[model samples]
Each structure stands twice: as C-alpha cells, then as structure tokens.
Target: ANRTLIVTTILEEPYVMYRKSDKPLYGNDRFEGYCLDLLKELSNILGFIYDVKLVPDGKYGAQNDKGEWNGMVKELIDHRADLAVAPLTITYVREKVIDFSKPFMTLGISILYRKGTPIDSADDLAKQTKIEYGAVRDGSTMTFFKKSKISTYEKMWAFMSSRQQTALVRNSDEGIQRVLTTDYALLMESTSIEYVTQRNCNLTQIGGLIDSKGYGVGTPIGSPYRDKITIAILQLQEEGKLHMMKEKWWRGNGC
Candidate 1:
C-alpha cells in the first residue's frame, strides 16, 4: 500500500474522462473511463497504489525537430511519471525512446461524416468534383496524405488546393462539425469515430480504417514495471476483461 506509481495521462472521452462539474475530485475520484478502469485493475493485480495526474501540456507526446520532447511522453522520459496510461499510440519513434506494453487495443485512421454522404474513400472524395473536404490541421491524416505514394492522393492534394477542395479545421471536433452542415468529410482516428458516432445518430463512419495502429501502455525505457504490465495486459486479453471494459464504457446501454 505504500508504493505509489505516479501515472500520467490525458483526458480523451470514453478513455480518460472527468465529470464536467466544477467541484474538484481527487485520486481515482478525479477520473472515470477505460484507462482509469484498466489502471484500477492493474493496481489490484499488481498490489500497488497509484496517483494519477493530467499531463501539463495536454498532448499525446511528440518530439520536435530539435529533439525536444513535450506532453505525456516527455513526462516518462524525464522520469516525472512512472507510467503513461492513456490512449497513446505506439510508434517506432516512441518505441525507440520508451518501452510499451503489448497493445491493449488496435485501431486505425478512418473518415467521419454526417448522415447521407457519398464520400467513402479517398478516391470517392477525389471523385466529388464539387464537394470540399475538411481535416484536422497539422494532424497525422495530413501527413498520411502528403506522403501518400499513391498517384491518386497526389492529384487529390493538387485538386484540394486548386479547386478549394479542402479546408483545414482546428481539430477533430471542428472537422466533424464542418461535415455536419457542408459537403465535407472529417478524417480522424477510427476509435474516436466509433465513440462519436455512438452518441450522435446523425454522424457515421464513412470508410474502413485507412491504416492500422495500436494503443499501448507506455513506460520509460528499461523500467522494471514494463514486463509486469505487459503480463497483466496479456492476462486481461485472455480473460476477455479488456473487451468487457470497452463495452461498458463505450457501448454502455447506448446505440
């Protein structure tokens, strides 16, 4: 009961969330979501205590061109926190710097739009000669399209600019709103697409995942707790606990 692992995380709905009321909450009371449930189970299985804190900069974690780090990833690298328990994506760059438990869940990029949309794929969007699409500005989807080796996307980018085929939204919510009233499509993570669509009958996921990725629990490189957390995740997977948790938080008595 004495050992306390300092866990760092960010608020992402259905994953890590806090009530909207202004009244302050503490310890586990401060949050309630999928990651929080996962952390709770991990603590029970591992027989240790933990304290959760939101990331100061409120970012998932990324490195700048100068090699400086920010957000939750930086907290781990700097030893400010013992574990990062959020929907942090596991990538080669992050893997090289920090260790990650096996993916608790797999996801990918996808499209979001309001009901009654014809855009289903990148090719479909390109085919929409009169419609404009919106995506999160500076988001990975841009990188995905910008580096797309496909000649189709290359042409789409040109058309997106030349014919005003694209508008840069500030973030996923903004892009999603644009899609609701305009001939626009929002490109964002599939998991978020699923979560949002469940709450709003008017929104729908437009296409299959464009790319597959995994979300993992991250620890600093060489942390002794890595293997332990990995084993816990494996056991949870075998017992179907993770799926149950997802169902509870996401599809809980909702559409």
Candidate 2:
C-alpha cells in the first residue's frame, strides 16, 4: 500500500505540458497543467504517491490491424502504469480493454480552421475537394469518422482514407500547423480547439460539436484504484472543483 503509483500521460497543451523554468525540472516537477492540478488533488484525496511518465509511443492509444494495443493503453495493459491521467477519451472499444473513471471533462469533436474560410461545418468540408481536412491519425477523432455511419461523416472518412498519407496528421500540433499554413482543416476535440483558438488569433473553431464524449481517468482492467478514483472525481464534480480547474487553465488572454 505504500508503493508509489506510476501515472502515464501525454504532453497535451492545457491538459499536460512542460513547465517553463529558468532552471531545469525533473520527473513530476517538469510538468504542469490542468491534468497536473487534477493529479495533485486526486493524490491528496486518495492518499497515494504517483510518478508521472510520458507514454513511450507519444500516442493516446490505438489498436493495430493485428489487434495489438499501443501508447498509454498498452502501458496499462502491460502493468507498466498504474493510472493514465490525461485527456484520454472514453470509447467503447477502449472500455473493453481498460477501466475508465467517471468523466472529469465532457467535450465533443469539432473543426479547427483559419479565419475567413467559407467552411462553416463538417458539411462544408465533406462537400468540398479544394480544401483538405483530417484528424490526428489513429486518434479518437479519426476513429470517429472511420466508424460513423452518417452519410456526411462517411463521405469525409472516404476522403481522408483516400489521402491518408497527406491528409491525416500525426498529432494535434501538426494538424494545427497544417491548418495555419495550408488549405487544411483539422477535426479535433472541442476543448483542444478552444485552447488553440484562444492562443492563435488566426485559428478558430468552425462549427458546433459533431459528437459528444468525455475524458476519463484510465486504469488497467480490474484495478482496485478505479472505483476510488471515480468517487474522487464525482466528489470533485459535486464541489465544483472540476469547473474551477477548467477555468483556471482554459481562461486565456482574449483574442
């Protein structure tokens, strides 16, 4: 019971990011963001020590054609990490392999594009060929398009699938840069788009949410800590701490 837990996370802006300091920092001290604050509260309430480590593969997690897991999910599956505290999405496929605590934040997929674009929504992107659009390859947003049966999304998926080599980006930052420099739009989580738009005045969210989802704390299947973490999350929600934490991180200098 005295053993310190290992927490795996990704370096996502506003959620988990490297803290800038004149002097170098190490281990947990090297990171700070909304998720870091959440970890601190959870540790205080749950009475556990944790060591933060970045997921080795730099991915959130996705299965390959062979059904092999990678990224933070694999870390949990192999018992290499005790918890995953990041903006990891709660998806049906992932739920079967790993346990997720009650959602700490709710969001939905949306578009990120430059200003003065005629593209207004997913429909605009789906109907046009002049401008290219896609999501982070293998991430939840891409998976959403691949799996959706809706005609619009199905069409969008076909376009992305056809040009996977050029359309699909490796990560959010890549996608954001593509949007800024070229005629590209990125389908991404609304919360992330919120953070990006705030800091980059030229970039903005194109439309309303496409589909709803939530970010949850993840644990290996059958881990005892899952329920305790869920309870702590619910406690934080009830006390309005979750909203407060979000505001603290998301409130940016206005555009």
Candidate 3:
C-alpha cells in the first residue's frame, strides 16, 4: 500500500498533456490534465504514491500478426509499469492480456471533420470517394473498422487498407491537421472529437458515435490493484467526480 507505483501514460490533449511552464519541470510534475486529476484522486483513495512515465512507442496499443503487443499494453505485460492511467480503451483483446479497472469514462468512435462539409455520418463518407477518410493508424478507432463485420465499416476498412500509406495518419494531431488542410475526415474517439471541435470552431463531429467503449486504468494480468482500482472508480463515479473532471478539462473557452 505504501509502495511508489510506476504509471504509464501518453501525451494526449485533455487526457494526459505536458504542462506549459516557464521553467522546465521534471518527473510527474511535467504533466497535467484529466488523467492527472484522476490519478491524484485514485492515489488519495488507494493510498499509493506514483511516478508517471510516458510510453516509449507513443502508441495506445495494438497486436500485430504475431500477437505481439506494443505501447502501454506492452509496458504492463512486461511489468515495466504498475498502472496505465491514460485514455486506454478496454477491448476484448487487451482484456485478455491485461486487467482493466472499471471504466472511468465512457465514449465512442466518431468522425472529426471540418465544418460546412457535406459529410454527416460514417455512411456518408462510405458512399462517396470525393473525400478521403481514415483514422489514427494502429489505434482502437482504426482497429474497430479493421475488425468490424458491418457493411459500411467493412467498406471503409477496405478503402483505408488499400491506401494505407495515404489514408492513415500517424496520430490524432496529424488527422486533425488533415481535416483542416485537406479533403479528409478522421475517424476518432468522440471524447477527443469533443475536445478538438471545441478548440477549433471550424472542426466538428460529423455524426453520432459509431461504437461504444470506455477508458479504464490498466494493470498487468492478475495484479492485485485491479479490483481495488475498480472499486475506487465506482466510488468516484457514484460521487460524480468523474463527470466533474470531464467538465473541467473538456470545457473550452468559446471557439
């Protein structure tokens, strides 16, 4: 209970981000955002000290053909980090390899695109070729379409796979830039869409959510903290702390 835990995370706006400071900050103090607040609450409730470390590969996590995992998932599997307190999605494949606490935040996939565009939904993008669309390469949003059985999603996946070089963006920032600068639509998580759309008035969510999922704290398989973390998350949810945190980070200064 008194051990200093190592927490693995990623640098994503409104989730985990670098704090803007005049002087350079080191260690966990260098970061701030919703996940940082969440971590503080979790540590207070669980009575543990933590050190945050960014994932070396800067990926969320995905399994290749050989079933090798990368990103925070790999960190947990290799026992390099005690917890992953970022916007890590809870998926079937990941659940099988690592343990996840109860979801602290629920979200789904959606399209992020420039405003005033004719596109309004995934189906709209699927039925047309005038506008190119893709997702963050190797992330859960892309994985969704890749593994989907739905006709529209399957079609989109085919389009994305065929032009993988051009369709896929390295990260959300690049995808957002593509949306702003080119004829492109980005399939991204709704929560991120909310953050970006709020900050960039010209950008907006094209449609309702495509699929539902949640972000949870990740732990290594059979880790003793999983159950405790889940309980703490439930407690926070019941107390409305999770909702409050979302409002804190996601509330943008009018665009």
Off by over 4 Å in 2: 252-255
Q: How do all models score by TM-score?
A: 0.85, 0.96, 0.97
Ranking by TM-score: 3, 2, 1
Compare the candidates by lDDT and give the number of the best one. Answer: 2
Collision pairs in model 2? none
Tens digit of per-residue lDDT, candidate 3, span 1-104: 77799999999988999898999899889999999999999999999999999999999999999999999999999999999999999999899999999899
- Candidate 3's clash total is 0
Specify the poorest-scoring 10-residue window by lDDT in model 3. Answer: 246-255
> What does candidate 1's lDDT look like per residue over 1-255, in tens digits?
587899999887889988555787766787888999999988888788998999998777766779677878889999999999998878776888889998998898787877776666867877666667645544346545655777877766666556443476655666777877787777778888899999999988887887888889989999988899989999998999999998988899321
Clashes of each: 0, 0, 0
Q: Rate the local accuracy (lDDT) of all candidates.
A: 0.80, 0.94, 0.93
| Ten-residue stretch with the least lDDT total in model 1 | 134-143
lDDT of 1 at 171: 53
Q: Which runs in model 3 stand beyond 4 Å of their true positions?
A: 252-255
**Overall local distance difference test of candidate 2:** 0.94
